[PDB]
């Protein structure tokens, strides 16, 4: 399972199980470039979020019901959606993943 591999491989589930996580299969620069695209509000009302003009290749990792540390279990879902990231700093880079649409 790609999700099981990448979550422990990326130090996300090496010390516990995370309920959900999203991976974007695009170049780093292409994702950083979203910080100057469609400005929209974040879920918390904050206004430093931006939506990508185009859909992107992503894989959603969701923990099944039979998942318990130390044996996490994820269901893998591949799709193409617009990503929403919060940006901050200089360079104005993405610091948080807000959502996919």
């Amino acid at each position: 399972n790609y999700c099981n591999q990448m979550m422990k491989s990326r130090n996300l589930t090496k010390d516990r199980c995370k309920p959900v996580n999203t991976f974007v299969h695009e170049s780093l620069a292409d994702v950083q470039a979203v910080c100057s695209q469609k400005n929209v509000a974040c879920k918390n009302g904050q206004t430093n979020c931006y939506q990508s003009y185009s859909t992107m290749s992503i894989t959603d990792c969701r923990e099944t019901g039979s998942s318990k540390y130390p044996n996490c279990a994820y269901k893998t879902t591949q799709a193409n959606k617009h990503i929403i990231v919060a940006c901050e700093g200089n360079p104005y880079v993405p610091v948080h993943f807000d959502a996919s649409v």
């Binding site: 990326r10 130090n11 996580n21 999203t22 991976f23 974007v24 994702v31 948080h96």
Partner: peptide, 15 residues
């Protein structure tokens, strides 16, 4: 140690 930009990258980027 790790910046928020670096953490976001390692957690969500699979280019």
């Amino acid at each position: 140690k790790e910046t928020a930009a670096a953490k976001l990258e390692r957690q969500h980027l699979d280019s």
